Amino acid sequence: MTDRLKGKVAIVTGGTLGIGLAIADKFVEEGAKVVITGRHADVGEKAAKSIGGTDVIRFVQHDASDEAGWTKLFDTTEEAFGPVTTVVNNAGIAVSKSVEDTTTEEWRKLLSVNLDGVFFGTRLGIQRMKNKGLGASIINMSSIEGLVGDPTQGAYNASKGAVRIMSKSAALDCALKDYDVRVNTVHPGPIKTPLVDDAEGAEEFFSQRTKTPMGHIGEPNDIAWICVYLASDESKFATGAEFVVDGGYTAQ
Amino acid sequence: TDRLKGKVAIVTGGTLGIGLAIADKFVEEGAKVVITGRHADVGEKAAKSIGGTDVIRFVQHDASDEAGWTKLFDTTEEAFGPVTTVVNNAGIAVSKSVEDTTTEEWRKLLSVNLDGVFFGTRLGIQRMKNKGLGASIINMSSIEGLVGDPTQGAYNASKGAVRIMSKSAALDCALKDYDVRVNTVHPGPIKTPLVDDAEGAEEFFSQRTKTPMGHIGEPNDIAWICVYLASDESKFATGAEFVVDGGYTAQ
Amino acid sequence: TDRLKGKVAIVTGGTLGIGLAIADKFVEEGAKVVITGRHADVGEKAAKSIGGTDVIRFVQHDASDEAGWTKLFDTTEEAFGPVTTVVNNAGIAVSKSVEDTTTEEWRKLLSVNLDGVFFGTRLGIQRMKNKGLGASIINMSSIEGLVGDPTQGAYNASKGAVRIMSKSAALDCALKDYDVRVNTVHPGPIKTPLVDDAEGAEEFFSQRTKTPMGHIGEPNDIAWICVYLASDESKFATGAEFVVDGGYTAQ
Amino acid sequence: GMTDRLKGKVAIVTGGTLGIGLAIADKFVEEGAKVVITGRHADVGEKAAKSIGGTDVIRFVQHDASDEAGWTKLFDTTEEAFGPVTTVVNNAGIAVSKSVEDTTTEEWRKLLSVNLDGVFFGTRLGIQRMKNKGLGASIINMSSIEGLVGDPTQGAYNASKGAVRIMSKSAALDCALKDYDVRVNTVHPGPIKTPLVDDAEGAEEFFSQRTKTPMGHIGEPNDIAWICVYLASDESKFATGAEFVVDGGYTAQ
Ligand SMILES: NC(=O)c1ccc[n+]([C@@H]2O[C@H](COP(=O)([O-])OP(=O)(O)OC[C@H]3O[C@@H](n4cnc5c(N)ncnc54)[C@H](OP(=O)(O)O)[C@@H]3O)[C@@H](O)[C@H]2O)c1
Ligand SMILES: NC(=O)c1ccc[n+]([C@@H]2O[C@H](COP(=O)([O-])OP(=O)(O)OC[C@H]3O[C@@H](n4cnc5c(N)ncnc54)[C@H](OP(=O)(O)O)[C@@H]3O)[C@@H](O)[C@H]2O)c1
Ligand SMILES: NC(=O)c1ccc[n+]([C@@H]2O[C@H](COP(=O)([O-])OP(=O)(O)OC[C@H]3O[C@@H](n4cnc5c(N)ncnc54)[C@H](OP(=O)(O)O)[C@@H]3O)[C@@H](O)[C@H]2O)c1
Ligand SMILES: NC(=O)c1ccc[n+]([C@@H]2O[C@H](COP(=O)([O-])OP(=O)(O)OC[C@H]3O[C@@H](n4cnc5c(N)ncnc54)[C@H](OP(=O)(O)O)[C@@H]3O)[C@@H](O)[C@H]2O)c1
Ligand SMILES: O=C1c2ccccc2C(=O)N1O
Ligand SMILES: O=C1c2ccccc2C(=O)N1O
């Protein structure tokens, strides 16, 4: 058969490791041109060619909280592959503190990436992709932590709940104005990534059946494939909705 | 490559509307499919419209017919091998408020929309567990399992029941390592014979105060999310709700 | 001051557990109450333990008995005047997975937990609408109407049905200016005969991984949210879910 | 009933000088609590306090909820007036009528500093000051139906109210697991007749449409006051981490 992302041009923030890496990998596999971003250009450069050549994928150093860099990022992708059709706001960071124990510096730093960065990408994505008949799709990475609380992830919970509902606002406005832009959120449960790998004992803790009923954590390809569905015209009637891939975590 | 390679699917109410499109795309992606429905003429024309008996067959079965469910699995397994995928899609509607619902309307709708889904889920678990099939049970709920509608009280009850019963099954299958996943799909308004035969339904649900996109969906919109859920691509998705509704429930 | 001044309530299953405490605090806040139950000895004692026939009375009625509902409303109206408040609290449990649920068990539980709430809601709307009563229908769902339980498949179905059916009723009543509100209450684990008779249930649900507060609740915890919902204090609350669960569904 | 439902409680109500917060403060005092109300404008604030009672039951403190250092002084002042705080209502909030697309970054940061950072400051400090004291403490965070559904013209506000919704669950869980005797819940009003709504031209008419609020009218501040009384009272000792929606049916359809 045929490529499910034929002619799509996608920005994937934080697309050099973990979930964002797999999203970029499967996007290219389905016919899309991809620009991945990340802060470490060393790590980011080798990540880009691990997927493919510069005719299908490229890396652009960019901090998702860099508002002005977002305009340059859209310009660079546009001159490389054509008008952007797909924005995956995946960059995010974690902070292992209860609300009580969160410093204001930790709070502000996490939210600048996890919330302001997603806002910058969604806002500019709408401005740059509306009214061009592109079948445009903005995919905002929330989490199961946008649906349930966690006593030791207070700031993260705030950021992911914000992404959850802000995305609905954007989806509604785009729909009511016939912008031809959809906005949806993805809510992964625990996924084996560097973020999880570097937290001591995280995978074993979240493999408890009282946490993930399947008794194991997921893999980055599990999130890649739902983003492929959401970037594709297969999902042209899906907007403002929450897509949960979590091993049953939130079902109990 | 075929996203449903080696899968064997039962799609109830697969002769019209959403279920027909689910069947169509399941076959397109490499699955063998048995579709059901009450009317045999519509059913045989439906199956042949999609393919030959090597990929798709029709079996006359009312989803509320408990005993018929075991025959349906047996028939599907003889034609195609072990069932891997059950799409509990058969369902009916009743345009009545809770206040105005007769008890016979209540019982009739729940026998199909709730008992039928229970029969297929329960038997699907029994017949598919512990076989390494990457089994997937896809239960058709609705946006009406998430929000109320003042004129579809019994339907609301049935779809809310399917929503939460499916989470029970998903959890039990996961905790027991059954290799069976269970998820619900929640379509918004979709252009189907159900909607076409309801006078002025499409115009009403195309209002922006109802569906923000200003139009209703098409059966393929639901087929493609069911393809994702039937495939091994979704091997970490269970107990979850997949909403394809034009923004209806986002406002 | 009485928060339920002038109110006349039917509380089904009001002879033990949660329903008993609801009736208790309803009378305390000035309501006249009819409680129902199947065992007449327990029922007469429940009523006498709260007050005399001037404030509270017992009627033997099975919530699944459709014709009995009309007699129940008639009896209550003749005793205390027009019914203003209906608490559909009667419910039962079955400790079976979806896979292991017999159709007999499925039908038994849903006849009480779903059909009974339907009968009480449908008749409550008919009998209380358009009378300036500040009428309130309070339907007892559960945390098991919000999340799944691998060993309570039929119960999950029933409580999910109650959750969404109640929204339908709330919307119709609000859009038609019936002066009837409908809301659902979602208790977490509560110390009642239902839980006490289930061996090990309290210990299981007191685990921090189940109830974060580390203990289960008490009947008065649900009585007080029901007083709020029955009172005119909540005149703008309809179609909503009131969760009193020790944090169970917040994680 | 025959007893003050908030006997012995000491409450801080941010944004307690108009609208919803004023009604919360009013009914809190009626049920026997001592209250400190905050706001930015002292003229409004001092008049609001006197409209409810004397300094034996209610006082005004001028405080911007986004002002982190002032949160410490606010709790200090409240303790000196009334004793240990038992109840925190994070109600101060502002709005911005802009789609996500049209939201300036300045508008984004300004609204979130009040609606999100302010609720974080007050929740974090409330836990620190009320934990482990046997007070039956309760933190009530004012979200909205706009923390449950989107609004195409309130992008930043949606973000703030979704954040409040889920951050509050985190705090509820931590407090419960640690036996802090602090509950945390969110309240989600639908449209309520307040200065915020009265000053938005056409807002009440728009939200009174049956397609928005099925009851065909918007609510009143006492509607939110009474669910806050329930949440601050020991009547709700088993309620934590939950969402209390008082919205005329708005989110049920
Ligand atoms: N893993 C899970 O279990 C899980 C579950 C649910 C949701 N999520 C969410 O999924 C997303 C991906 O998480 P992950 O597990 O893949 O994390 P990860 O393994 O740490 O990867 C994060 C990626 O984002 C990049 N990044 C970090 N900060 C950035 C910034 N300010 N600007 C641009 N790029 C940045 C990182 O590159 P540099 O280090 O070079 O910046 C890296 O490429 C996050 O939003 C996370 O919250 C993860
Ligand atoms: N259309 C929508 O807007 C919409 C939105 C959300 C959810 N849904 C749900 O999606 C599912 C499909 O709906 P649809 O709109 O595609 O309906 P439809 O166009 O009326 O098609 C119904 C299909 O089910 C079959 N069927 C009806 N009763 C049956 C029974 N007792 N046993 C077995 N098969 C039966 C019908 O064939 P026979 O008549 O020959 O039996 C037909 O093939 C239903 O569960 C519905 O509730 C629909
Ligand atoms: N306890 C919990 O943890 C919990 C949690 C969430 C929800 N709930 C729900 O709360 C409600 C009350 O539960 P509970 O724990 O208080 O139950 P309980 O202790 O078993 O009390 C049940 C009451 O209902 C009556 N009853 C049972 N079947 C009936 C029928 N067919 N018709 C009329 N009355 C009937 C019983 O009296 P007779 O036996 O004499 O008829 C008794 O008065 C139920 O809907 C339950 O699903 C309970
Ligand atoms: N009204 C509704 O329909 C509605 C619906 C859902 C949720 N809500 C939420 O309910 C809460 C109260 O809304 P309302 O409609 O009652 O608002 P309102 O009528 O505008 O009253 C706002 C109150 O907050 C104070 N305030 C504003 N900014 C502040 C700041 N930075 N620090 C401290 N106090 C501040 C105001 O006093 P000063 O101006 O003197 O500071 C005033 O006392 C808000 O969180 C709002 O988001 C309202
Ligand atoms: O009936 C019950 C029950 C009994 C024992 C423990 C938990 C629960 C629950 O959540 N519901 O609804
Ligand atoms: O502030 C507001 C508001 C104003 C006017 C109508 C509805 C709303 C709402 O839902 N929130 O949160």
Ligand SMILES: [Mg+2]
């Ligand atoms: Mg809605």
Ligand SMILES: [Mg+2]
């Ligand atoms: Mg949970």
